[PDB]
Design a protein around this nucleic acid. Sequence first.
DNA 1: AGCCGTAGGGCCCTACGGCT
DNA 2: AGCCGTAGGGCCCTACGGC
Lengths: 670, 672
Amino acid sequence: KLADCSSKSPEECEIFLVEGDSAGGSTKSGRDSRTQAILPLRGKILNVEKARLDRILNNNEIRQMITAFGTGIGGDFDLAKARYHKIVIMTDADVDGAHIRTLLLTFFYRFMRPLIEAGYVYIAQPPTGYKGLGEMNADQLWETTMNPEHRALLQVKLEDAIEADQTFEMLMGDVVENRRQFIEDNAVYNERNITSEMRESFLDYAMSVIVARALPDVRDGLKPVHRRILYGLNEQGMTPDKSYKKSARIVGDVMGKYHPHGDSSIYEAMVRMAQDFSYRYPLVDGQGNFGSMDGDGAAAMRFTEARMTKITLELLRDINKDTIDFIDNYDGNEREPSVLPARFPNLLANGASGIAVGMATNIPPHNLTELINGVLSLSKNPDISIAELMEDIEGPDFPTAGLILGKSGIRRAYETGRGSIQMRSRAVIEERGGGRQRIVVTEIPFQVNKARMIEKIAELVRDKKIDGITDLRDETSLRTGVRVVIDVRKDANASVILNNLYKQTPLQTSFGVNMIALVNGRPKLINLKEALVHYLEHQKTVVRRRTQYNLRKAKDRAHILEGLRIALDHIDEIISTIRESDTDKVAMESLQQRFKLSEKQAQAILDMRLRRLTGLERDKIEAEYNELLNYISELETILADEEVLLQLVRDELTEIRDRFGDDRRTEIQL
Amino acid sequence: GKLADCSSKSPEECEIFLVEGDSAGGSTKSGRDSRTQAILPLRGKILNVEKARLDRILNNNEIRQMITAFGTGIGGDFDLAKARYHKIVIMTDADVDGAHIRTLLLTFFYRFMRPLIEAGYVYIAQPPTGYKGLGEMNADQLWETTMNPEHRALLQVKLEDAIEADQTFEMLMGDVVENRRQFIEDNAVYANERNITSEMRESFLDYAMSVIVARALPDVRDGLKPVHRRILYGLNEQGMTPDKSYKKSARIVGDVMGKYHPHGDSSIYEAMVRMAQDFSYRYPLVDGQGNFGSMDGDGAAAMRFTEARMTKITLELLRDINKDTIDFIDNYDGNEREPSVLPARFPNLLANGASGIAVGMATNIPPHNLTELINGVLSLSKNPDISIAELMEDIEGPDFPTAGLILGKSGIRRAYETGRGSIQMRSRAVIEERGGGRQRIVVTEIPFQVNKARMIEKIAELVRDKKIDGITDLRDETSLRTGVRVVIDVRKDANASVILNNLYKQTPLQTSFGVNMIALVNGRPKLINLKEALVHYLEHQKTVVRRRTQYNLRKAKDRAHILEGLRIALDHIDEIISTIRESDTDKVAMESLQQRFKLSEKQAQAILDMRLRRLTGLERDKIEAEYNELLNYISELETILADEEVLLQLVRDELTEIRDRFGDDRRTEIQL
DNA sequence: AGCCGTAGGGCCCTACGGCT
DNA sequence: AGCCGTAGGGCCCTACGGC
Ligand SMILES: COc1ccc2nccc(CC[C@H]3OC[C@H](NC(=O)c4ccc5c(c4)NC(=O)CS5)CO3)c2c1
Ligand SMILES: [Mn+2]
Ligand SMILES: [Mn+2]
């Protein structure tokens, strides 16, 4: 992968480390070939502070860096064999670039500290506002970043070896809690000291993953990638009524406008939203192969198509009625929603799982009928207890059904945001003839790979670690549903074998509830009541803002209609006024003065087509006006009375419950 | 392997379905009856065993997986009794590439597993059209249409006559191109049980004709293959003009794939990349931002990173496309329209060249200097009977983006007279001193289509292997500032001219361009000479300008007709308004206006659509002026259409303007 | 030879946290 | 252990004709 320089005198030679060949190509084209070598890596490198030594020494990118530098590692590290006197970290100007820099520095510090001490390690400073170096023309890269005469390299300086050791250990080591603490204490919502670099770069990454990747918002239940997909579907009018649209086109659009990351991240998030074994209320309606419970992936995105589900319309409902705040997209050329109106409680309905930095989230899905009944009960009683809420919300309700064992895990999770929930397959024992039996499994636990689970049983039977099983078959089909059959040896006890399978396979699995979501843009562990309270407050705001928007707009339109009504009442004078005017400007002025019109009204009259003078058109103007006056007084009633508003929220939730609410799938056994 | 086997183990009730890959295999696996139906995903095009030797065949992963899965062995050791399935079902995608994969599968079965065919174990599934591949189908649909024994319609493959079948496999799938070419020419039409010979002939012909007429060969008129046409049209439709900002490559590609070009991402993106590369295209058609590859064979950055738009000269390909100059057609699924051909206001086929490997034939057309080409067309426009030697007074020869040298005029002349000929390209190399009484060879230009890094590696190999004497060092000193610079140090006292001549003999420093000018002419492949290529280009331009003139005429007369209606309305506005006001509906008004004022329906409609702001004082004047200018314009257009020589002169003038704006110096030196 | 350029098709390494 | 899901990053097999 090394594209070496022609010179072999270390003192004038430089090596640039880039993320991959997309970046490597702009670099290779821009460089001075004589003195500047280029080593493309392959994205994120091994974190050597967490890895075993042998994994490190067998890692292909680690080996290539060692070979390139020529110095060996650790003990045998020989400075005078360095093939370059500048090693330049040139990752992309994005948060993942920052992460890759923290990773590279960790490796250098732990395995090549003398390289740092001798002042050989540098950080390049490519311009922001590019996704990667492959986005830059070679000449831009050269002039800004690589050319000795204009570039601003940062030389990496080690001051305090003690503070450095503690910094690498804290940020990059296996103990999460110290890293978590560092983030909470530091989170805000020429030479470079290596400790300062590691801390600022690592925090930059940590923060972005926490607030803008891996955790959902409490209000709409979405992570960024999901919000941008759904928003993208909305902007391209890909509603359930219209035909499916090619996935490649959806992804291309989302990536360009909103989500500056790899296609796999976008496509796979969309795919999960279309899987009825993953989403309790699927948000995407997929055409074609969208994967299976056996861990088959979707067909490639060139083959599939998609659109919104009907329930996703309720997530996006009234997004264009000034209900939620828009923000600039990543490059200032587009607007995107900060959050979706989310007219059902999607966070709890669909759940969320997310691996961040310093923390993670794991929120199970719920029955939408129960959830909405929960929100209605809270709406009538702000002081309701978790125990009273559990009269509506019994516990999780997984798309894959199955059993939950007991209530005490659910209770703890709802009270504290954390708890362990034991899940089991739906399995029965039945006769198969000749006095023989079988175990038949028709539902498996949430997030368990069915084919993996079966191979695990096949393995146990082969290693003779389970007695009694004479055959094992997946008889799943579209027509029959999930059906996994385990034949048992004649006169063996099938219940014992079943209990053994629960102990030794994912036929029984735990769900560790860890309910962290973004509240006011900050990560927080929340309980059931707080999730519902944040949801309800969001709904009040959305409906209130929609009411205010509809009021302003209706007033604007009535204002225009009053102008048109005046014009119809005095049409001969209107025509005369315009005919005697030389220009539009003069007409506009005369219309405003003669008939006491606003600029907006005069412009509307000037914009009126002659067809609007026919009988039916005159009547429509008046009908629309009288209808609007009514509408305006309805809107005003709502805004004058907080109880009327709250009731409106309840009636709208009730309508969604009646239309989309469905039966409980997962049985909570006592 | 990825064999997804069924549970039953009685051959006689078991079926195995062969599909193109995992995308298809996932729909198949979700839809199937897992008791009796195994699925084996392949990996796209399989080895053509009629062209490959045994070592290659038996080491091919997909071949091996099929041999293993069927259990019969192959060849002499074939045993029908060990078949693990009594139905082997070919279920490729319902497209031409699917048909190709079917012919490849049958060739394998026929040559290695003939008894399987003879025993009636081989079947062809018939999935429905309108899907890009099986992965586009829901599992229930795939089951009900294709796999369900209660409703499906398998074709059982029958071998009637083994001698005819032998001949068919050899002609269609074998190494002799000419008989395959003869087969296509004899059968092509341009613009249950299943006999295996009939299946092979029909499926292969489908594939071959589709590659010939709709993939691999350029149209003589605009010089474009379908993928490049769809990209450029796509850019135009989304208004990605040179004046607007760069658009992300990923969005262009997804857009083009969705609307026009139902093929892989990499086929589209790489075609776009090439059009943006100034070492590939003599006149680049795409303006790229970011890493778009190098002369060392580095690819472009992944499409997530790059951006693109049209170049200025591409606007000239698309000029007048919205003025009914070219026929639009339905796209592949009937939801869009696309151009059959671009107006192509410069002769793009010869300007940028073309290479393409089809079936039965290929094309290799070198690029040319646009100034020279246009002068050639002009000379032709004045003299239908102009000779090739005369044309060569304007068009000296190819002009490659990479410059360099062409040795002599013999190969050029043969290529322009016949459409075929070998042109010797040579690097630009000089001998120069390097100090200490030593010399070096310096190369600053290389032949078209030569990978610079690879040429350097070939030189290193000659040196390392003692196949060339006198080279002491070898470096690529190329840079953005320097341009291409490859240096070969020569040993003190060695003759550098002799070393250079040896390099020309033994390395890509000198390379042949084999001209083979095949293009689509009236939608069929034709070997054409220079004059024929220019003639068709000139005819296309006459048609474009005539049609544009006709279009403008129609639009002018329509506008004049509306303006006559507006004049009347403004001259009688009070009666107009009163007519409309007493009318209850649109229809009534339209009728009363028409009867009272001798208005057409279009006139009455335009009046009803008139805004009140059009009644201001200077409007009757603006309408009178426009009408007077229009009348003038109309008669100017009528002149053009009544006089062939006027039309042709208008063609000449537009070409000349393009030459003056875009024509550039020759790069490639032709040495005599 | 293997390369030129439109086509068919797919797989594997890395970080991150918490649960087993 | 190693899986879950958003993220960083990339490579190799095939057909086809001509030289
Ligand atoms: C790169 O280095 C390696 C390494 C070896 C590999 N081994 C196996 C498979 C692969 C990649 C194959 C995989 O197939 C699906 C493919 N994309 C599409 O179908 C597609 C279509 C259209 C678009 C699109 C994507 N993306 C957009 O932004 C919108 S337009 C994405 O990549 C390998 C790649
Ligand atoms: Mn990057
Ligand atoms: Mn296919």
